[PDB]
Each structure stands twice: as structure tokens, then as C-alpha cells.
Amino acid sequence: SLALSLTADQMVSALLDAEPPILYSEYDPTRPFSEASMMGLLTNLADRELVHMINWAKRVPGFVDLTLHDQVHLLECAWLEILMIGLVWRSMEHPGKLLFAPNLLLDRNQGKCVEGMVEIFDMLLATSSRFRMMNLQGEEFVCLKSIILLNSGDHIHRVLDKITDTLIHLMAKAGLTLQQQHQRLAQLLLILSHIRHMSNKGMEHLYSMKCKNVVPLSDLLLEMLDAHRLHAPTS
């Protein structure tokens, strides 16, 4: 695998180059938010982001070396996580706000339009505030996002080790001491547990019956949801 031969700088360059674009939503400032209109916005946005995420994944070193099944499995598991870390990253310099899109900047009060959504909005906001306090760097972000993709579901474990090496390389380059490197590496990885948690609780609402009935979902998104709901308790 050519991914295992990359240098740290090459790894960073490839990941930075593979970054998806930031998309817009069709929000109307004159129209007040209902449960349906709010869900309609986020669903439409997430659905368009999914297509970009799928092609982004193919440009993650080592991913295209996997079988089609494992590629599908990893993406089915990680998709909401990857959407979420993207959200909290672009919301970093907007304290108390969530920048879903440049034209869609929401706070926790707007999240109360949707039953059970303000709780996850709170968690996302705390995560974004956590990244801001850590002064998370863009190079570190793309590493964390790739880790999420590969850790969601021996070759994979070799790539993960490489990204760990890459993270350490970035921190040592910033002038951090050895102790400060270990600690920061830990602080970043533990945040992934919180990202996993937010995804689990968020997905639980999303594949609920109230949530699948409120707005039309695309066939892609509908299949991403059912991949998780399969393990949910049957009433």
C-alpha cells in the first residue's frame, strides 16, 4: 500500500487537499422556523454533504485499498460523526453558535424547534468550545476526521498508526515538548469519544418514527439511517 510509505508532510498535504467544500443551505430569513422547516434544511444540507464525503473518503490514504464492503461499512458507521466534527470545526470562531452553512448560523434556542435537538446542539457547542480552548489546528483537524472514518467500524491499524505519527509530527513541529505532545494527543482522541456519543444519541432521534416522518429523506440518507437502526430495539 502506497499510503504506508507516505511521509508526515505528505500525509498532511494529501488530507488537506482532499478537504470537501463548504456548502450553502436554502434558509429564508423572513420565514420563522418550524420543526418541519428546520429538519428540511438540515436534511437537505446533510444529503448534499454526503456525496462530497464519499469522494473525500476515496482520497483518504489507505481507504481505497480496502474492499468495497469495508468501505461501505466504515462510511455507514461514521457519516454522522464526520458531519458533526465538520460542523464543530467550522463553528470554532463563532462561540455559542453553530455554523451549519455560511448562510445558516444557529444557536441553541433555534435547536428547540425540534424535539430532543437542543440537547445535541448543547453537546456540539461544548465540543466546539473545547476545540477553541485547545486552539485546534487545521492540520490536526483533518487527521482527527480521517481517524474517525477508519476507527468507526491489520491494514487499517497500520494506517491509524501513521496518522498518529502524523499528529505527533505536527505537535513537535509546533514546538511542544514530549510530555505536551502525549497529553495533547490524548486530549484530541478523548474528544472522539464525545463525537461518537453525540452521533449515537443524534442517530437515535434521526431514525425514530417522528423523525423519519417529518420531512422527505433521500434514498441515500434513508439507507445511511437504516444501517444503524438495524441494531436498535424493536419496540
Binding site: 464519499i54 476515496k58 468495497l68 461501505v72 462510511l75 455507514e76 441515500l220 439507507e223 445511511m224
Partner: peptide, 9 residues
């Protein structure tokens, strides 16, 4: 045959 499977090609 899943859509995600198709998009990955």
C-alpha cells in the same frame, strides 16, 4: 444493491 455502494465506484 446499495446506493453508497454504487457511489464508491
Amino acid at each position: 444493491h446499495k446506493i453508497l455502494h454504487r457511489l464508491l465506484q
